[PDB]
């Protein structure tokens, strides 16, 4: 099996969102990933279940439990993302796992954490980011907050911190010879994800007013603009030298505009930039500014990404069943990753305990 | 030093956004982190570091740097491609003085290809791979999700997964290697769920018309009587039904939860209901509930929130609050971040390491 995480053995108790996204990446990088789903369901639809062996097993039954408990015994990592108490009351808790394998990295993916008042509440991405200030900061100032899909709570502030915890604990287990419990809460990870704003907030460089900051769309030089065809460009020309390059491509003379960072005159500035970008279509701007430091790029829809040169040449995507999918990231010089394998039709848990000798 | 990464040694060449964030998290978890800046701190992102100066273009500045890297486990650089090569700090020069080094390259566009030398920021990397187009209301231009998705989630976090996966690989092979983390790639994997969903006909390229983009009335924010907001995330029918009951809404009178043609009508009924009381009222009503209804707090209110206070998600420092390390560890727990450690001379650090 190809990739830097070759050898690594992972047990994933089937859940939704972060838990599986973490498991995918471990797989992606060559870990051996075994997912136990409920029998009361089931070759899979979700391309998120790539780089995976799937096994049936009713964990409520006494048999199901011990089979599971065997897999965990011969494995490096356990991933679960159920509310607190669920694995305990199944007989798969940390304390129970530590008795068949004190090397186990016990990885617990939740929104709210393992304790505290909200620890039993149901929730999704949007709820976790609502409590820690993030959601309030996203969207235009004249309107209600808009959810950044489930990118910030589930994945960026959830799965990815689960991965860092798993892999940091594996580094630890090289010294001490023992595993441990990784407690990944989306509300905490997403908070560290936005540490920049907490830092800027302290030094007067970020306010709580939505749509009135450097990076939220309030700056006319860091925002999207509608073009003549109703498609969009993005502008991220923060540094003055890049902003100057953008102005020249737009045909605007700096002498006729207000200063880039005079906020009181951002309305005028925005109006000027808006009229300029509105006068040609996205693909015009795309050409004018390619190879340029103007920080102006076309805003592509998913369906167009496969035609973008830089995306094609670096193989950011591969084809798989009437749909493109992202190739693993990041990339490794010596132990490169493979193309992911599609979800691996169900298997029997004995066959896996056997294969794992 | 407290944390699961005690005695990991990390050299960081100073830049902006992702590279510093990754270095921060490494520090947060107990790693020894030395950051080389240029002779020309306030940012709390520079927490859990030692800062040193060094003209990397001088003969001596370079010599010193290579003496650090020789002793360290990980090097982090976030410059445009070619930049570290020309300084004399490229992968191959580093592999001469330390074949074990994990060499971590943090860019937006990647190491090669047509845009590889183009300046950019977060908003640009996510414009090219479909992400930015997908965010915001439908009647309107896309809105940047701050720089959470390219710099951090699709950026620093993938650098970290790569640094630590390469540390694992090393333990079996004795050898370092190069980690190429590009924000346009990481952010693409970060949104793999949408790519899966699109392949099976359960996501469209229309903005504001999906389960998770704000187009679903059960997955969106709502304005309340006081002008503040709640978030609703009641995807599962049982959670949704719990929410209707607490709103005072008889299910029989409403359109089906998932009849999309009638979402606008559904949304107008839920809008009226949420508008009729203040945000704090809904926070009370739905506490301990599975209704998936939560107050949308502004940054300055977060320190007053029970679940935040009691789990110590933040700590106080300097101006105000900062996030404590994540994730958390049972045995080898992280400590409260140290503020940034004012300029020390780089020779000191070298005697301190062997
Ligand atoms: C493809 C797309 C559409 C899917 C999708 C993706 C993403 C999302 C959004 C955006 C997200 O944010 S996903 C994140 C949700 N939050 C979390 O994951 C945080 C922690 N988890 C939770 O809070 C819960 O799992 C939650 C999702 C909220 C609610 O789930 P629930 O109450 O139905 O389940 P629960 O976790 O409390 O308990 C599970 C239940 O199942 C049982 N179980 C598990 N496995 C098996 C098995 N193999 N055989 C038999 N029984 C089994 C457990 O024992 C337990 O039973 P119990 O006795 O307690 O009732 C939504 C949907
Ligand atoms: C707090 C706020 C204000 C900060 C802030 C945070 C975040 C953001 C947004 C949201 C972001 O997206 S940050 C991410 C930006 N993109 C990237 O980092 C991707 C990779 N990097 C780049 O593309 C570029 O570094 C770029 C950010 C575009 C800026 O380009 P640049 O030309 O200024 O720099 P470059 O990388 O081309 O070369 C740097 C230059 O510095 C020199 N350097 C470094 N270290 C030293 C040293 N110790 N002593 C002497 N010289 C030194 C290098 O030698 C090099 O010089 P060169 O001779 O080649 O011109 C914006 C601002």
Residue numbers in the entry:
A (entry chain A): 1 to 42, 45 to 359
B (entry chain B): 1 to 40, 46 to 359
From the paper:
The ibuprofenoyl-CoA 1 side group is a phenyl ring (C33, C34, C5, C6, C7, C8) with terminal carbons (C4, C3, C2, C1) at the C5 position. Here, the density completely covered the Cα-ring and extended to some of the terminal carbons in most active sites. Clear electron density for the thioester carbonyl and Cα-Me groups in the ibuprofenoyl-CoA 1 and S-2-methyldecanoyl-CoA 6 complexes shows a cis conformation. The thioester oxygen forms hydrogen bonds with Asp127, Asp156, and His126. Ibuprofenoyl-CoA 1 and analogs and 2-methyldecanoyl-CoA 6 were relatively potent inhibitors, with ibuprofenoyl-CoA 1 displaying the highest levels of potency (pIC50 = 5.05 ± 0.05; mean ± SEM, n = 3). This level of potency is ∼20-fold less than the corresponding values for human AMACR, where ibuprofenoyl-CoA 1 and analogs had an IC50 value of 200 to 500 nM (pIC50 = 6.7–6.30, respectively). As expected, all these acyl-CoAs were reversible inhibitors and caused competitive inhibition with a Ki value of 3.04 ± 0.34 μM (mean ± SEM, n = 3). In contrast, ibuprofenoyl-CoA 1 is the most potent inhibitor of MCR, and greater variation in inhibition is observed between the other compounds. Our results are consistent with a different mechanism in which the side-chain is held in a relatively static position with the different stereochemical configurations accommodated by a subtle clockwise or anticlockwise rotation of the α-carbon.
α-Methylacyl-CoA racemase (AMACR; P504S) enzyme plays a vital role in branched-chain fatty acid metabolism by catalyzing the conversion of 2-methyl-branched fatty acyl-CoAs into a near 1 to 1 mixture of the (2R)- and (2S)-epimers, enabling further metabolism. The catalytically active enzyme is a homodimer (with an apparent molecular weight of 83.6 or 89 kDa) with the active site at the interface between the two subunits with catalytic bases contributed by both subunits. Key catalytic residues from the large domain include Asp156 (helix 6) and His126 (helix 5), while Glu241 (beginning of helix 9) is contributed by the small domain.
